[PDB]
# Entry
Amino acid sequence: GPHMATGQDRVVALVDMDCFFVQVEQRQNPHLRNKPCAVVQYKSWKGGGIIAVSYEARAFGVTRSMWADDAKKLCPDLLLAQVRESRGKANLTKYREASVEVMEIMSRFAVIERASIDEAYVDLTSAVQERLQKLQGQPISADLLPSTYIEGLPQGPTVQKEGMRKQGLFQWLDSLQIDNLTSPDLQLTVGAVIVEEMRAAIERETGFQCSAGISHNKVLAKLACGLNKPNRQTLVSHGSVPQLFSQMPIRKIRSLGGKLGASVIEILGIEYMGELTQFTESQLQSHFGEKNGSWLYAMCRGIEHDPVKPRQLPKTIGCSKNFPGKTALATREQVQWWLLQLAQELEERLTKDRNDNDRVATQLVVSIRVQGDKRLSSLRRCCALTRYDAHKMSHDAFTVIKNCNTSGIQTEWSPPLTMLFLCATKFSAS
DNA sequence: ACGGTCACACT
DNA sequence: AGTGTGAC
Ligand SMILES: Nc1ccn([C@H]2C[C@H](O)[C@@H](COP(=O)(O)NP(=O)(O)OP(=O)(O)O)O2)c(=O)n1
Ligand SMILES: [Mg+2]
Ligand SMILES: [Mg+2]
# Structure
């Protein structure tokens, strides 16, 4: 009991933008605002794939990955913003740049880890101690947490959601012992205050609304963030974990969404995260491996040690395009032209990256898929990247994958390529 | 015909 | 260096 480590050492927040691509388009185009809206790419095929959905639109059942034509059936008045197309492919520059706006603001408060284009993890442990020191035996007002939810509260002895939020928050605050600096719950609470400030700054400065989860680790922070979206932040305490995890589907936990989560469910015959507590660390390790087993054992107990990496920028800069079914490239000239298009966009992004971030990519990775292959990549190959030259990069990429072309004629390409991928990696200071 | 990107574990 | 999984 005295020696058991509860994973309450850190205060971690995950801030995730609400329907991010939609918001970027909405900010730029006021007409989209407060309306059922979605962002689509490649309009020609079935109206284009939906990649982002406004909350008004989600009410109609519109979802990501839905074809726009299908979405229209559910929501006749659905408004659509198209992903920019450059050189015959979708260009995500606007959203990347919008992401930078958010990331830079967040970086002001603490070192951040860029988990995705629209979200980043924040370790507020240092910030919290300092803030706790700044306010002395200073009780924390509810006003400082206007958008905060306390998961699991209210409990025990208004049918409006805001009323519920307030009751829960009040129960939490009344419970709090302000005087003790060490208390994890107090630390989470102060962390929540900062997140409120972080989120207000984001909205004021970009016009983008976001949600956040405050907890002692990344997994819990991420899970918490989703609980009260949109435009709200949720504090998941260590104590709330048992009840929260008791009915929490295993797939919900980050990294348990795929095969591992399925095997975990299949092998152990359980549905909920909480049920994982019944197994010894060794038991979990035997089925899912040493690293996974330890992670699962600690995680179902609300404990995770994965640190918030200090990484604001992406480690890689990549361009890729799919050429599905009939559109697969079956000629050498075709492959070369598309490689060139990818290389050109990559070059523009690489050049801007070098100026902005003082770094150069020393390695080029070329990936392709042949028709009928199961795998996302038929082949992956890498060559040195010494110049930010689109022609050289595309020329080099062709050299690397050219032998994949079986056909004797060599003016043709067989099998036709379903996918082309170019990625710049191994960045170095410059 | 569930696209375009990213990170990272395993080998 | 290459492959596969998971995420968003
Ligand atoms: N499969 C996916 C998932 C997300 N994205 C993009 C579009 C999203 O707007 C953006 C952020 O992803 P997301 O946070 O998981 N969902 P989104 O931000 O749109 O809505 P929220 O549920 O977070 O409020 O990345 C994508 O392009 N392809
Ligand atoms: Mg989001
Ligand atoms: Mg996200």
